[PDB]
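Lab notebook, page 48
Experiment: co-folding of the full assembly
Goal: obtain a model of how the components sit together before planning crosslinking
Operator: M.T.
Materials (sequences as entered):
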Amino acid sequence: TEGRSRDGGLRLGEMERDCVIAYGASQLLLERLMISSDAFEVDVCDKCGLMGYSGWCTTCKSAENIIKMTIPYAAKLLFQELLSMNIAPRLRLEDIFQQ
Amino acid sequence: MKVLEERNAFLSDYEVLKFLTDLEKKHLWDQKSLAPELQGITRNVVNYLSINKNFMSDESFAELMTKLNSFKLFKAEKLQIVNQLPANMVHLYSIVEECDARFDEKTIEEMLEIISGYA
Amino acid sequence: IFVYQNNITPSAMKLVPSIPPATIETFNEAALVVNITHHELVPKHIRLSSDEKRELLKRYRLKESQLPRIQRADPVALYLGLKRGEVVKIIRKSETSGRYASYRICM
Amino acid sequence: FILSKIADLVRIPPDQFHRDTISAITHQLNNKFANKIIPNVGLCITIYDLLTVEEGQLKPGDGSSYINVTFRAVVFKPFLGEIVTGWISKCTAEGIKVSLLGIFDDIFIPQNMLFEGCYYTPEESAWIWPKLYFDVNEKIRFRIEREVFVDVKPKSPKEREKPPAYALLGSCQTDGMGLVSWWE
Amino acid sequence: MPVCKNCHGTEFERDLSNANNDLVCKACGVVSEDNPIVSEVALESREATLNNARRKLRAVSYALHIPEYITDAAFQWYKLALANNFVQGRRSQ
Amino acid sequence: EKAIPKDQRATTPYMTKYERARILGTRALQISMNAPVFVDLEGETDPLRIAMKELAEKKIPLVIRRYLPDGSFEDWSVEELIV
Amino acid sequence: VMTISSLEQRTLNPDLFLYKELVKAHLGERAASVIGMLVALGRLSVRELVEKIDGMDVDSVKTTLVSLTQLRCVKYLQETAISGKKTTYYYYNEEGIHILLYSGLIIDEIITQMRVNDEEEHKQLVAEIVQNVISLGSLTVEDYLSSVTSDSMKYTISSLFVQLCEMGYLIQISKLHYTPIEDLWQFLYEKHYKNIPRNSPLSDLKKRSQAKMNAKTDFAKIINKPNELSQILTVDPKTSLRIVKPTVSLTINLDRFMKGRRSKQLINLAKTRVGSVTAQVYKIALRLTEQKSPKIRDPLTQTGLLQDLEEAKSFQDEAELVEEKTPGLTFNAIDLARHLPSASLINSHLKILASSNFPFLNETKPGVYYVPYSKLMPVLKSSVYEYVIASTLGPSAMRLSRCIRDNKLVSEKIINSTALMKEKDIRSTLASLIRYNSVEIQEVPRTADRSASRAVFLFRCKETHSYNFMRQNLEWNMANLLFKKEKLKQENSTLLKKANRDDLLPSELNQLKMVNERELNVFARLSRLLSLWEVFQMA
Amino acid sequence: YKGEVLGITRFGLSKMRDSVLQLASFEKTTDHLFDAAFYMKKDAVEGVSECIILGQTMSIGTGSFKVVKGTNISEKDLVPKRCLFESLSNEAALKAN
Amino acid sequence: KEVVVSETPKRIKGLEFSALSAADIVAQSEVEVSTRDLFDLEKDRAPKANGALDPKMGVSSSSLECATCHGNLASCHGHFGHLKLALPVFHIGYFKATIQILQGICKNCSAILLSETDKRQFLHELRRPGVDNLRRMGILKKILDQCKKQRRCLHCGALNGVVKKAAAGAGSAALKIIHDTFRWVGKKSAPEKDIWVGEWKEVLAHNPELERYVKRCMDDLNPLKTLNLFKQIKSADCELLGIDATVPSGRPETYIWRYLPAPPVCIRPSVMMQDSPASNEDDLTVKLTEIVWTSSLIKAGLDKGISINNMMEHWDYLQLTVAMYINSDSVNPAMLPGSSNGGGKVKPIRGFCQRLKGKQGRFRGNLSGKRVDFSGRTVISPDPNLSIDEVAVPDRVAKVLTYPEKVTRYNRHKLQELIVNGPNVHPGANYLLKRNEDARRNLRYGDRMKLAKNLQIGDVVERHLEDGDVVLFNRQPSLHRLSILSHYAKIRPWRTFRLNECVCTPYNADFDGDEMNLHVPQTEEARAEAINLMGVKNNLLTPKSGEPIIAATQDFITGSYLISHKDSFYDRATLTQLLSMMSDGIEHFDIPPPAIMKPYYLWTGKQVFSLLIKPNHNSPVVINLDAKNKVFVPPKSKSLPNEMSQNDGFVIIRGSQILSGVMDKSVLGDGKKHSVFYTIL
Ligand SMILES: [Zn+2]
Ligand SMILES: [Zn+2]
Ligand SMILES: [Zn+2]
Ligand SMILES: [Zn+2]
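Observation: model returned without errors.
Model output:
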């Protein structure tokens, strides 16, 4: 929640953020705009990539292909907005390991 | 993750359960050791596999194939004969193709005397 | 090869690319008075053997495309008269590091 | 029963870094397999042997190493037509559900090849024949034919059981079947 | 209303002291929540005549400087008699 | 595409400087999860400072993989590489 | 929602949606999918396939492709690049399965040749002949009778020995034959702009018009070469009578199918406008004219060659004049007593052509009896639609839309004033109309610049869309049902291949009637449907 | 880099650079977005700026490399062992076929 | 039992961007919106059976569950809603591309207008592996334009017309589109000229009024007209128009709205009732919940009654509305208002497309700019005695500012005791987390003591901000690479951020009255990252010119000068307490020989400040550097070293003793490549 008063939390904006690039630090980002900003999981489906929840891809009655994973809840918000309008950035996935 | 080979090596127990008793000697060695939960099936594994042997050997494995190499049994009952139905009478004939049929007297008979070498 | 005198019709340029097994070279003279190649700023450019290409790509373990490019019909490109996929090694002379070089390709 | 060449990935927790590799591997695959069942193939017991271990890869967050290997594992795959020990546990008139102790009762042999002459009683007997009934826990040679793998997890906000994922079937088409002392 | 996941405490006290705003029962020591969410920053037969109803009402109401309140109160009464259809055949005044 | 043999090595013997970054972060992050430490460890503590104290001893088991752009892989043991 | 509205299975696939189940239900397996992807992207290279389809390269590909071949399912284009080597591109052969999806109506084609053996096993014999050919596509007499038992009577098995020729039958695949039309007008389009005897350095126009003619006049005998060639038909061996060439595989043409089937719908057309005896009369007049009638063999030049606001409307006039005169030789002038079951004096009863008047037929050479043909079909084509909506949607919907045909771009009061119904209806039905095209609604700004309320509205037809929006009619039930058939198979699949390979149980006996009567619904259903579907896809 | 002078403004940036979400990090993200899904772009997750949105690891810097630990493993113990259940019964299927 | 679940770590690669099938949309969502808003208000505020807001669709406040996935805000991520729409409806988002998709094809028989091998030409071109997103753009541009010049279609024989985007900019016809019959040439007569004037013939013949008044209006396409019009536009072109037709995209019959995805409730909640009966609306909810109305009108009207006249503007009011619903177009084009209006034109209508467009929001002000946790804010004030690279953070925030920790082994003795101190006293914890990841335990309830004894190895507990912790530290007007640094943490009393001065200039901190912000990492790797990389001692130089940016500033500069000054002298006692004051207590020394002897053995500031560099015999630093201070005074040019001028000169150091010269910026003062501190580094 915003500012002082209501309650705390502060503002890391673009111009400030871009700085931490020039130190090459990844993990400061992965902590910063990821874990402690919105720590969030989304249930997604390889087939017909979209965002479901729990046990369904809901475009395909499925209860299978889901992969529990982590994304900024801001990012989910961005998708659902988009997909609430007509557009679909269906996802592609890959093995993190195995080269 | 993907199974590369599902049907690979057809495996009964001879030393199998024995080597399970070996890893058992390695891990926790059943109940009598007093002098992970994985142990639960180990009993269920051995249980009937054990008792029918009671109601074993090692070299009988090698002794098994010796004359058995000459038969029509393929690999199917040829492994199944080792344990279930101790190689007698209609039991042996009740399964594999042409078990009596063509080859009869000494073929079904040796099974009775060869199993007496073990069971 | 030949050059425009002054006027340039697109009617001739309607179909310029007549003959595949040979090719054309077409200029207007006004752009060529003092040769750009000889001037000052333009570093010296060297066309390389199409075989030398592969050697180069393997030195840096690179495939084609994915390289510093040159727009077709650049005058300097036209000066060498590049065709598709011709590669040029370029030595730029300035004192910062010193004399050194790079590469580009028609695209 | 049989043996199989299968591959998968393993997460080795940090605590085990004192212990030998294969053991942590072993213990892990155990916790992953053990009493469980592996779909459309069979139900493992433990892994038997192991091979092709590789350089452990890693992801930034966890920090625990990951090693994806393959191996041949102890598994269970009976062939189709077979005569084997077992017995009634929870059954109906038509067909019986045969059981070996401590493994599972999931096998239910219906009655088709089972002898035509029979009579059911609600007392103690499935079908007694013109030879007779059979008992629980007793060695009972029965035949199986077909196995069916049903994964079937309609896990849902809707449904929030029917777990016979590994199911077998058979009947008694010859003598000594359903009671071993008919033969023997 | 809810109860602790373990201690079975039903009494929930929300500490605002440290500006975490975290609600916990004095019976357990475990919050049941993290970071409570908070907010930020006429075509009808009846309802058009209802805009008329407040309009004429609110108009004629406070000409006497009667409470803005009590007017609102009486409006719902006009809706009450409106339900009974007491409002049909008589002079609106 | 596959691994490059230890015979042929093209890159600095010197540290990435991000070697010093993720090698440490990883290491201490392990230590937090309680893996044994290979160094003389004095009465001090914390999941980072003891890793620092370690690395001067070059006792860290880790090995950096290096991807060229072509995907030529690469390997160097931390102990192999030099400050 | 619960799949019963079938929106996915019925929501975004026009056209090809037909074909994929055609082959799927028909050939299927891996063999199916390739065809759709073809018709999806069209022009395709063999190497280009498995880059996308993932059809298990060169295994299915070479297999599936040659599978298509024997049944000629796809266009086969083979050529070479300019640098060298070779390259091939494949399209879908005409509509390919179109041949197939008619199927038993081709059995009805035999009902024309049903004569000379009536209510026979010989009927079902020659039926087996035909369907076997259709199944295998191109066949040779020599390989056929080779596969058939020998040492029997050649003119008995199917007696079709001599009747192999007749009207329909086949025609060998020759070069361009199953090769794409537009493509072959490009290949044949060569040799003229390719062969230019250096006339003038400029003005291709003088070289163009002639070469087009040269392209046009050559194309004539190019497509007429397959039309009929008797060097097949010639063979008159010893101890025998004239047969077609037994050696070569030839293949059914849908030409006789085209006219023959439509002709029935025409017998229906006049069968409305005319009387029973006159109806059957014209019906038997069809027998000879259905022979050389081009009919839907028309499109021809319709594809691949430059049209013109002059020369397409000018060069098409030719089609309009052609059959009225020179094939008019083949056509009715004086015919005598085809069969008859009217009786007694037939000759003035033959003047019954005169009664056939309007709005079709009844155009002759002045003082002989003749039916227009060349322009008959076109003026016929325009007529065919009409009642389509009648009890489909609304009785009055016709008369107004029918009126909408004659009038054009007017307005609603002017509609309200021209015939009958009140605004509550005329809006309804016309709003009900629009709910399915048939409108092309004009509007013009009134007391505004461009806006709605202030402006005023106009209504027209544009038969283009009209004789065009009904193609999703094919998408309508036709594929969808075809599913509903093959959607049912899996239910009885446990029984089906058991029951078929068997030749039991009470419920099996029960569901046999369900599935078989169900078949009576599903196919003869289409027999209705397609019969309608015939029109718009053709002229 | 590409062919010639450009860059740095909505036209100029829109040049090669193929990550459309970071082209939405800039300006005009309406017709950019719609425009993209129209052409059915495959795109990719590549640019570092792009990376933080989807929140996976950075592609450079600290994330310039994957990292491995020493296995300290001997392939020797990888040798299987069996009494060869397969070998013994093989010869019953060899003859008469 | 228990089929083995094999789950794998999988990370995003790539985003497939495409349209939405009529199917997939409705294939997903729960309920047709149908109904109206109305919230069917009975027995409750918004009991709302079905309707635009449905409990199964999603939740707003925290009261009722979500049905589909219950658990209110703590759980549900939302669900769509779908919309039956009378007639098709046009689209503002795909508008200007939909122009093109309409353009390149013949308006009659609907086949791509360019043909033959040239079709194949562009095809074979687009399938060369060197395709670029550019070559997509430019190539498809240079195939597109071939449309406009082609007068007549191939098989239809009819001419074509160009669509000019009917009217301009007013927003009312901005949705409408018009092509024509163009290039009539006025002399050569296309047959459709006779056909066209023959069309007008009868209403000419009928109502000879408006015809010649307004005229030449040509024709448009209704979104219905183009809908069915696409349904003869098949296969073939596809990517020639820019779309691969694998499945879903099932041809550009997607790009006009036949069904509307309804935003999940979680996206745009109606602001809660907040003390009283006032219930704050939300625009999307309101706008689309009218889109219900304007639909259902055209549903029931047009089901029987109404008119062609009263129809189109309703239908038009639809496409205009949904148009606004996503995006901007025309704001106030003198329309007159609809339901729930007032006619004041407030402004507050857009903000769905504009939601992710400018300023603070989704564009790049909220998502790329995310607002952050675990932080603090204060003002500045010095502590030179505080070492460089430690912010001294006022403990009073440290009480509430935590750090996550995983216990084991080494940890227990600190943590196990660090707990029993409880939250209030400084060296302690507050929240605690077991191995069972239940939620967490604040110390509020009570205990510790016995509960501290538990302390398994898998346990997680938070600390305060203590000695030797890790911090990063920021000033808002962030110009460049130096605008962030990161420091070790020390704790002191009072309340404010206090740091060491030499790192001011990186922050360009003026002290004065200004602010900062305070961050701590969470995960370990972040610490080791920023502390041993992005901290001070490694980052000491600016990237731009490669100079040390940190140095003495103001006093420290001049403060040296006074000690540095030649004319000064000191005493063994003086030098003593000095060398003390230089490094607090601690470090041993070795007194250099006395500068001057016989009148009392003085020493010189040159010498003491020299010791500053090299304190000890065992001190391992050796330096030699000479340079130009400022206010360089020329010697007599005969003297070769600028060392000796009449006053100072080159400062010079050989053997790590200062030889000559005052220092004063120059050597220690940033400003220049040569620096005492730069050299040392
Ligand atoms: Zn899915
Ligand atoms: Zn509690
Ligand atoms: Zn939900
Ligand atoms: Zn056209």
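Interpretation: The beta strands of chain H are 67-69.
Next step: discuss with group before ordering constructs.
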